[PDB]
A paper describes a structure:
The [name] gene [name] encodes a Nudix hydrolase. The enzyme robustly hydrolyzes these compounds, indicating that it is a [name]-X diphosphatase ([name]-Xase) that hydrolyzes substrates of the form of [name] linked to some moiety X ([name]-X). The [name]-Xase from [name], may be a member of a novel Nudix hydrolase family whose members fold as asymmetric homodimers and act on bacterial cell wall precursors as well as RNA.
The 1.39 Å resolution structure of this enzyme shows that it is an asymmetric homodimer with two distinct catalytic sites, one “open” and one “closed-in”. The C-terminal catalytic domain contains the Nudix signature sequence that encodes residues involved in Mg2+ binding and catalysis. The two HLH motifs stack against each other to form a four-helix bundle. The approximate two-fold axis of symmetry relating the N-terminal HLH motifs does not coincide with the two-fold axis of the C-terminal catalytic domain dimer, making [name]-Xase an asymmetric homodimer. The asymmetric dimer has two different Nudix active sites, each with the conserved Nudix box sequence. The “closed-in” site can accommodate a Nudix substrate but is too small to engage RNA. However, although the “open” site could potentially bind Nudix substrates, its cavity is large enough to accommodate an RNA molecule.
Author numbering:
A (entry chain B), B (entry chain A): 1 to 203
The structure:
């Protein structure tokens, strides 16, 4: 593909993205258009010919099948209490995290989720568990739920469009849990792994 | 622009656009994402030598939720040699495994694939690594590649419709690898984790 054809596609996509940035009324759509606009701008700066044979060989294999969905969670313990967050408009609590996003590794995914939800930079210590939601919180979609032990670094919690509150809870004083995201049984297993009283948990 | 960066940009923009289609509640935002997906499809056609079937395979929506996909692999060592399999119609070798199927847990998935491919029942001993395919073997889809250390139990290898051959190889006498499934660098890393020279590998 020639540079001029690449520029054509990029400019057409930028037009649509800019329209989204002007007209959308939804903050989560706005975030997506901001992400797209940033990527497209970088791409335009880098516009060049592309080796279409090389592109095809990097893309292969092209066939893909549905798998369980990636979910990432952070296990953060301070003063023997666990960090839980409560979503906007929700009355239940869960470990920070959410869907794994394409374009980020497993550890980068949890760090991205921690920063966006909690307002803190963080470090990943270890993977504590890989849970199957079919075992612990059966739902219409199946997830592979990675739970990483993490430490918070610099930052500050700020209520935002995703998260209404962030608090630390003793395991014998847990609040109402969002079961589809984390259960008391999972928290108890995680505490055992965290304290080195059993090995990494795998479903 | 580098080929690898083009593929990562495309992969990411497909994921964002698909997330917009699933989550937006406004018909004009829906149309914007649809128009973006049409442009991504046109750009991919022009940027790559993929045939029409292959292009459709890349663009076929795999899921309503765009996340990295599951791939599972088995690390089986006997007499200090590593089990590799060669698929029917293929000249190269990989660790047993494949994509994670919905309806099975991560360990159940690897045990199922070990039995189907190698003819053996097995035990999962530990998780050795979770690799990001975007790092080690970039391809159209991003996978979280779980590599489980496993021990074979009862059974027998028989050539079947999926697998042409199964052999054990010394760490320093590896055959030609199916790199989109496993690389020499990954095998070397895995050997170090397996031998306890370093901890679990996580991207």
């Amino acid at each position: 593909m020639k540079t001029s054809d690449f520029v054509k596609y990029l400019q057409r996509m930028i037009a649509i993205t800019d329209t989204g940035l002007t007209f959308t009324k939804d903050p989560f759509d706005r975030e997506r258009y901001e992400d797209l606009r940033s990527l497209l701008s970088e791409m335009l700066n880098q516009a060049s010919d592309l080796d279409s044979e090389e592109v095809a060989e990097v893309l292969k294999p092209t066939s893909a099948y549905a798998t369980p969905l990636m979910d990432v969670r952070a296990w953060i313990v301070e003063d023997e209490k666990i960090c839980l967050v409560r979503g906007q408009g929700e009355d239940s609590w869960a470990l920070p995290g959410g869907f794994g996003e394409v374009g980020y590794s497993p550890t980068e995914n949890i760090l991205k989720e921690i920063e966006e939800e909690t307002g803190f930079k963080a470090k990943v210590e270890r993977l504590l568990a890989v849970f199957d939601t079919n075992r612990f919180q059966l739902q219409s979609k199946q997830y592979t739920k990675f739970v990483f032990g993490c430490k918070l670094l610099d930052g500050q919690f700020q209520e935002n469009q995703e998260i209404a509150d962030l608090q630390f809870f003793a395991i014998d004083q847990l609040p109402n849990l969002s079961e589809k995201r984390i259960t008391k049984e999972q928290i108890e297993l995680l505490w055992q792994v965290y304290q080195g009283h059993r090995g990494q948990y795998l479903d």
